[PDB]
Structure formats: structure tokens, C-alpha cells
Structure 1
Amino acid sequence: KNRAARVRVSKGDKPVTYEEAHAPHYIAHRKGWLSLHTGNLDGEDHAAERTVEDVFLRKFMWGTFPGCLADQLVLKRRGNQLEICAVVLRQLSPHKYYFLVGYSETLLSYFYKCPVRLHLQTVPSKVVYKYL
């Protein structure tokens, strides 16, 4: 019996999202990679740095946007540029949303010395793929 990035089946009252509903052997079969970079490919390097900065910024923005997110992040690094993509809920105010967006953008830029942009999609309530 293997338990890896999968949810235990309940009576059927458990809203679950696509990525955590599907198993870790459906990554390329029925899913996509959350992060997109070339450090994993052959010939390049700095993969450890890519991964550590990925996890860092993921946890950072998760903790600076508490209770608002409804999924994991999606990172898109095209050359030097960095693009964050998130899905959040329309709970707090657009004032707070924009202020936190600018703050996080500035911090990421001054920290990683990288040009960064962020995009977020609003949802009334987090989508559900199944009821497990």
C-alpha cells in the first residue's frame, strides 16, 4: 500500500481538486507540471537553486495570502522573466489584494534580483472536481 500525494477516500463529503485528486503517476499522463524551468533538462545547471527558490516563494506567497488561495501555484520562467499564476477567492478586498500583490512583487524582485510579474484568477468558492 502506497500513500503519496493522494487523499484518503471518505464517505463522499470531501471536496477535492484536480491535482490532489489525481495520483503522482498521472503527472504527464493526465496533469501538467506546476513549475516550468530548464534546470531539470540536460546541459543546464542551477536546478537545486531553481527548486529551492520555487519552494521558498510558494510558501512565502501562501503565507502572505492566507485563506485566499484555492490551488497550488503555477510558475512560468521565460528566460530572465518570472511569472507567478495563482487562483484565489473573492473574500478580502481588492485594496488588500493589490497592495499585497505589489508588496510581494517588490520583495521577490529585490530578493532574487529578477524581473517578476504576478497574475491571479478570482473565484467565488474554490472549485471542486470530485467528492471523495
Structure 2
Amino acid sequence: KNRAARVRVSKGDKPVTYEEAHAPHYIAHRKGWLSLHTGNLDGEDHAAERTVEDVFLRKFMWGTFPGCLADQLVLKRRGNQLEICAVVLRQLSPHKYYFLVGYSETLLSYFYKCPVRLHLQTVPSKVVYKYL
């Protein structure tokens, strides 16, 4: 039986998001990609470098906004701009979100030598697609 990226059936009490509820064979069919760049197009270079950066940004944001992320990050690249779109919860005070936004954008801009921006969308709770 296949396992890769499959939330297995339970007793009907496990809430799953839309992304978590779709196995890998639905990528490009019912769900899009979590990162968009030109590295994987035919005749394009630097796919390896873009990949390492994406893996780091996901770990950085997970530990920088602990317990706040309500979904996976969406990483977008246009030119030399880097946009990070995250869906967060409404538990931390706004002051701490503004501190962490100013802190993370500045730190990542100096780390990867490019203008980085972080767009936050807050939700009252984790959006549930179904109960497995």
C-alpha cells in the first residue's frame, strides 16, 4: 500500500486541511504547488539553489512563528523579489506579529541578498476541509 503524503482514515475525528486531504497524485489536478519559480522549466538553471532556499524558509518560519501557522507557506518569486504568504492564527497579539514581520523580513533579506516580503492572512481557527 502507498504511504507518501497520505492522511489515513480514522474514526472521523481528525480534522484535515484541503492540502493535507489530497495525496500526491492530485498535484496539478486538484491542488497547486506551494512554491512557484522558474527553476524547473525546460532550459532554466539554479533549480538546486532555489530548492535549498525553500526548505530553509519553511523551517525558519515554522520556528519563528511557533504555534501560529495554520497552513503551509506559499513561496513566490518574481525577478529577485521573494514573497512569503502565510496563514496564521489570531492568538498572538498584533504587536508581536508586527515585530516578527519586521524581524523576519529584514533577516531574510540580508541572508539571501534580495528584497523579501511577508504577507500574513489571519484566521480564527484552522480551516477544516473534512474529518477523516
TM-score interval, normalised by the smaller of the two chains: over 0.9
Match of 1:91 in 2: 91
Q: CA deviation at 1:13?
A: 0.2
Deviations 1:65-117 (CA, angstroms, capped at 9, x unpaired): 01011110001101111100000000010000010011000110000001111
Q: CA deviation at 1:42?
A: 1.3
Count residues in correspondence: 132
Match of 2:30 in 1: 30
Deviations 1:37-59 (CA, angstroms, capped at 9, x unpaired): 01111111110100000010111
Backbone CA RMSD of aligned residues: 0.6
Cα separation, 2, equivalents of 1:37 and 1:4: 24
DSSP 3-state at the match of 1:77: strand
Structure 1 segments of 4+ aligned residues over 3 angstroms from their partners:
none
DSSP 3-state at the match of 1:30: coil
TM-score, normalised to structure 1's length?
A: 0.98
DSSP 3-state at the match of 1:88: strand
Identity in percent: 100
Cα separation, 2, equivalents of 1:43 and 1:103: 36
DSSP 3-state at the match of 1:8: coil
Specify every segment of 5 or more residues in structure 2 that has no aligned partner in the other structure, as ranges. none
Cα separation, 1, equivalents of 2:74 and 2:66: 17
Cα separation, 2, equivalents of 1:102 and 1:110: 13
TM-score, normalised to structure 2's length?
A: 0.98
Specify every segment of 5 or more residues in structure 1 that has no aligned partner in the other structure, as ranges. none
DSSP 3-state at the match of 2:83: strand
